[PDB]
Scaffold this motif. Structure first.
Motif, PDB file in Angstrom:
ATOM      1  N   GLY A   1       1.177  -1.128   0.200  1.00 18.12           N
ATOM      2  CA  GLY A   1      -0.542   0.000   0.059  1.00 18.12           C
ATOM      3  C   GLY A   1       0.681   1.369   0.105  1.00 18.12           C
ATOM      4  O   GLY A   1       1.763   1.446   0.730  1.00 18.12           O
ATOM      5  N   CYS A   2       0.454   2.072  -0.871  1.00 18.81           N
ATOM      6  CA  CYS A   2       1.107   3.669  -1.061  1.00 18.81           C
ATOM      7  C   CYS A   2       1.162   3.775  -0.043  1.00 18.81           C
ATOM      8  O   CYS A   2       0.673   4.200   1.520  1.00 18.81           O
ATOM      9  CB  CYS A   2       0.442   4.442  -1.605  1.00 18.81           C
ATOM     10  N   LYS A   3       2.371   4.574   0.895  1.00 17.01           N
ATOM     11  CA  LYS A   3       2.342   5.119   1.642  1.00 17.01           C
ATOM     12  C   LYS A   3       1.567   6.121   2.656  1.00 17.01           C
ATOM     13  O   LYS A   3       1.159   7.514   1.723  1.00 17.01           O
ATOM     14  CB  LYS A   3       3.824   5.840   1.616  1.00 17.01           C
ATOM     15  N   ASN A   4       1.042   7.577   3.729  1.00 16.17           N
ATOM     16  CA  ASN A   4       0.377   8.259   3.591  1.00 16.17           C
ATOM     17  C   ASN A   4       1.397   9.620   3.727  1.00 16.17           C
ATOM     18  O   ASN A   4       2.549   9.388   3.130  1.00 16.17           O
ATOM     19  CB  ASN A   4      -0.328   8.120   4.876  1.00 16.17           C
ATOM     20  N   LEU A   5       0.769  10.513   4.323  1.00 15.68           N
ATOM     21  CA  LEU A   5       1.229  11.726   4.592  1.00 15.68           C
ATOM     22  C   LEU A   5       2.272  12.397   5.699  1.00 15.68           C
ATOM     23  O   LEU A   5       2.419  10.755   6.620  1.00 15.68           O
ATOM     24  CB  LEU A   5       0.492  13.007   5.180  1.00 15.68           C
ATOM     25  N   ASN A   6       3.774  12.358   5.840  1.00 12.59           N
ATOM     26  CA  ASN A   6       4.764  13.013   6.397  1.00 12.59           C
ATOM     27  C   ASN A   6       5.114  11.459   6.385  1.00 12.59           C
ATOM     28  O   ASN A   6       6.080  11.016   7.521  1.00 12.59           O
ATOM     29  CB  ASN A   6       3.990  12.929   7.932  1.00 12.59           C
ATOM     30  N   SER A   7       5.477  10.624   5.473  1.00 11.42           N
ATOM     31  CA  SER A   7       5.559   9.111   5.389  1.00 11.42           C
ATOM     32  C   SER A   7       7.132   9.309   5.446  1.00 11.42           C
ATOM     33  O   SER A   7       7.692   9.602   4.272  1.00 11.42           O
ATOM     34  CB  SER A   7       5.030   8.795   4.436  1.00 11.42           C
ATOM     35  N   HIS A   8       8.062   8.570   5.900  1.00  3.46           N
ATOM     36  CA  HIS A   8       9.978   8.516   5.994  1.00  3.46           C
ATOM     37  C   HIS A   8       9.392   7.622   4.289  1.00  3.46           C
ATOM     38  O   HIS A   8      10.202   6.739   4.851  1.00  3.46           O
ATOM     39  CB  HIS A   8       9.976   7.867   7.373  1.00  3.46           C
ATOM     40  N   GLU A  15       7.499   5.920  -2.821  1.00  5.48           N
ATOM     41  CA  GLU A  15       6.482   5.082  -3.271  1.00  5.48           C
ATOM     42  C   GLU A  15       4.750   5.709  -2.446  1.00  5.48           C
ATOM     43  O   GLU A  15       3.840   5.187  -1.251  1.00  5.48           O
ATOM     44  CB  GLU A  15       6.285   3.975  -2.483  1.00  5.48           C
ATOM     45  N   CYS A  16       4.885   7.347  -2.425  1.00  6.79           N
ATOM     46  CA  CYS A  16       3.698   7.923  -1.675  1.00  6.79           C
ATOM     47  C   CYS A  16       2.398   7.873  -1.952  1.00  6.79           C
ATOM     48  O   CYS A  16       2.193   8.033  -4.135  1.00  6.79           O
ATOM     49  CB  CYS A  16       3.886   9.834  -2.012  1.00  6.79           C
ATOM     50  N   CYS A  17       0.963   8.560  -1.510  1.00  8.54           N
ATOM     51  CA  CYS A  17      -0.182   8.047  -1.910  1.00  8.54           C
ATOM     52  C   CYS A  17       0.167   8.856  -3.182  1.00  8.54           C
ATOM     53  O   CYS A  17       0.629   9.783  -3.380  1.00  8.54           O
ATOM     54  CB  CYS A  17      -1.490   7.427  -1.533  1.00  8.54           C
ATOM     55  N   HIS A  18      -1.252   8.636  -3.631  1.00  9.50           N
ATOM     56  CA  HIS A  18      -1.764   9.449  -5.244  1.00  9.50           C
ATOM     57  C   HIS A  18      -1.703  10.629  -4.515  1.00  9.50           C
ATOM     58  O   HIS A  18      -2.402  11.436  -3.652  1.00  9.50           O
ATOM     59  CB  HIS A  18      -2.908   9.153  -5.589  1.00  9.50           C
ATOM     60  N   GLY A  19      -1.376  12.142  -4.875  1.00 12.25           N
ATOM     61  CA  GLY A  19      -1.318  13.480  -4.293  1.00 12.25           C
ATOM     62  C   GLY A  19      -0.104  13.618  -3.780  1.00 12.25           C
ATOM     63  O   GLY A  19       0.249  14.470  -3.382  1.00 12.25           O
ATOM     64  N   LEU A  20       0.556  12.785  -2.720  1.00 14.96           N
ATOM     65  CA  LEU A  20       1.666  12.770  -2.176  1.00 14.96           C
ATOM     66  C   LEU A  20       3.334  13.229  -3.127  1.00 14.96           C
ATOM     67  O   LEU A  20       3.305  12.345  -4.368  1.00 14.96           O
ATOM     68  CB  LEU A  20       1.847  12.426  -0.846  1.00 14.96           C
ATOM     69  N   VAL A  21       4.019  13.695  -2.513  1.00 12.79           N
ATOM     70  CA  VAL A  21       5.181  14.084  -3.215  1.00 12.79           C
ATOM     71  C   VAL A  21       6.705  13.540  -1.736  1.00 12.79           C
ATOM     72  O   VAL A  21       6.386  14.536  -0.984  1.00 12.79           O
ATOM     73  CB  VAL A  21       5.175  14.843  -4.490  1.00 12.79           C
ATOM     74  N   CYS A  22       7.815  13.189  -2.272  1.00  8.20           N
ATOM     75  CA  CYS A  22       8.887  13.005  -1.100  1.00  8.20           C
ATOM     76  C   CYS A  22       9.355  13.982  -1.311  1.00  8.20           C
ATOM     77  O   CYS A  22      10.328  14.143  -2.284  1.00  8.20           O
ATOM     78  CB  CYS A  22       9.423  11.479  -1.890  1.00  8.20           C
TER      79      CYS A  22
END
Length: 40
Positions: A1-8, A15-22
């Motif tokens: 599963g994609c990583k959530n916000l503020n995900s290390h 591999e951030c969810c749709h809408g987030l970026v590293c």
């Protein structure tokens, strides 16, 4: 599963969810340059 916000995550992958970026934080501390999934 994609990583959530503020995900290390690393600046290598994204591999951030749709809408987030590293991306690195604005200001934290000396040692500890860890990137997190921010809301692009």
């Amino acid at each position: 599963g994609c990583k959530n916000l503020n995900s290390h995550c690393y600046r290598q992958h994204r591999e951030c969810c749709h809408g987030l970026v590293c991306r690195r934080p604005n200001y934290g501390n000396g040692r500890g340059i860890l990137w997190k999934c921010v809301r692009a």
